[PDB]
Amino acid sequence: KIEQPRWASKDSAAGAASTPDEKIVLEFMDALTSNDAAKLIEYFAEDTMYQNMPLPPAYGRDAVEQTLAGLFTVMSYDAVETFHIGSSNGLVYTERVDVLRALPTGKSYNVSVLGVFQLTEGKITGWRDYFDLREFEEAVDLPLRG
Amino acid sequence: HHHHHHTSKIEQPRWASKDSAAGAASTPDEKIVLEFMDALTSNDAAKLIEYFAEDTMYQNMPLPPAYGRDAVEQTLAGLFTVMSYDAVETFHIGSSNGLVYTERVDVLRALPTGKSYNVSVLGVFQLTEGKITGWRDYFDLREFEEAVDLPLRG
Ligand SMILES: [K+]
Ligand SMILES: [K+]
Ligand code: NI
Ligand code: NI
């Protein structure tokens, strides 16, 4: 389960994809729990990028896929609850909670995230997740930045 | 007391759609937010809280939320005690369903240390009747703290 924060909009539509791009992203999200870089990479354009901002950016489609793969080595998504999704000028935004589990220790933690996606022809030409890395490491005892 | 350590210039990221347009206010609420951003460099909580509704909240997600206008101002004012906005740059602004989104860079100075850092922020704003009923900034707190030696957590 994921209880929904008091501050989450009570507009019934703020959770639902409103546009094509948004449907995609929501699906991509749904596909994240596959924990499969090779599968996930599909949503991406050739000319793309990716970054969990506390960590370094990955440019180009195969870097992106490779970063994904390496992450999936120590951790796995158990759940993605997306509270708000919105869009303007070709970028899509998601406020969600990712339930991530750390493979080495088995502990999981509910990470508060706000991501931006850049799409071009339904192709993810960009993906950037903003969150606090430290409280995650501390929770599941899995360091990722020295 | 330490001298003021060298502000770092704001870089246009490889991914920041030049374009912009994409960084311009396309809607009324957006123009409001863009204006609120402008106000932040005033480092004046009194100026800022007048953008808020009574039913409102404020949270830097690595830090505790403030609910209610009264708690919001205490938070804002408290931050301005140890910290100061030198600049804010918004690459991407957008909006749907009553929420505005800003992908921006915050240039902050730690008052006690004189040191400066550029925080990569993605923040979301909820508005109502033209007033901020919610404000949440997402970023990594540790990389900021270490950069300028201002531990804030707890
Ligand atoms: K929506
Ligand atoms: K815009
Ligand atoms: Ni000292
Ligand atoms: Ni000094």
From Swiss-Prot, chain A:
Phenotype when changing residue 50 to F: 15% of wild-type catalytic efficiency
Keyword Hydrolase: yes
An example molecular function term from Gene Ontology annotations: limonene-1,2-epoxide hydrolase activity
Signal peptide: none
Annotated gene: limA
Organism encoding this protein: Rhodococcus erythropolis (Arthrobacter picolinophilus)
UniProt keyword terms in alphabetical order: Hydrolase
Active-site residues from the entry: 98 (proton donor), 129 (proton acceptor)
Organism lineage string: Bacteria, Bacillati, Actinomycetota, Actinomycetes, Mycobacteriales
Pathway note: Terpene metabolism; (4R)-limonene degradation; (1S,4R)-1-hydroxylimonen-2-one from (4R)-limonene: step 2/3
Protein name: Limonene-1,2-epoxide hydrolase
pH effect summary: Optimum pH is 7.
From Swiss-Prot, chain B:
Recorded GO MF terms: limonene-1,2-epoxide hydrolase activity
Annotated pathway: Terpene metabolism; (4R)-limonene degradation; (1S,4R)-1-hydroxylimonen-2-one from (4R)-limonene: step 2/3
The keyword Hydrolase appears for this protein: yes
Keywords on record: Hydrolase
Keyword Ribosomal protein found: no
Upregulating conditions: By growth on monoterpenes.
Thermal profile of function: Optimum temperature is 50 degrees Celsius.
InterPro entries: LEH, NTF2-like_dom_sf
Catalytic activity annotation: limonene 1,2-epoxide + H2O = limonene-1,2-diol
Annotated catalytic residues: 106, 137
Effect of residue 104 to A/H/K/Q: Impaired protein folding and no activity
Signal peptide stretch: none
Field pH dependence: Optimum pH is 7.
Entry EC no(s): 3.3.2.8
Name of the top EC class for this enzyme: hydrolase
SUPFAM superfamilies: NTF2-like
UniProt family annotation: Belongs to the limonene-1,2-epoxide hydrolase family.
Job of this protein: Catalyzes the conversion of limonene-1,2-epoxide to limonene-1,2-diol. Can use both the (-) and (+) isomers of limonene-1,2-epoxide as substrates and also has some activity with 1-methylcyclohexene oxide, cyclohexene oxide and indene oxide as substrates.
Complex formation: Monomer.
UniProt name for this protein: Limonene-1,2-epoxide hydrolase
Natural source organism: Rhodococcus erythropolis
Lineage: Bacteria, Bacillati, Actinomycetota, Actinomycetes, Mycobacteriales
Gene that encodes it: limA
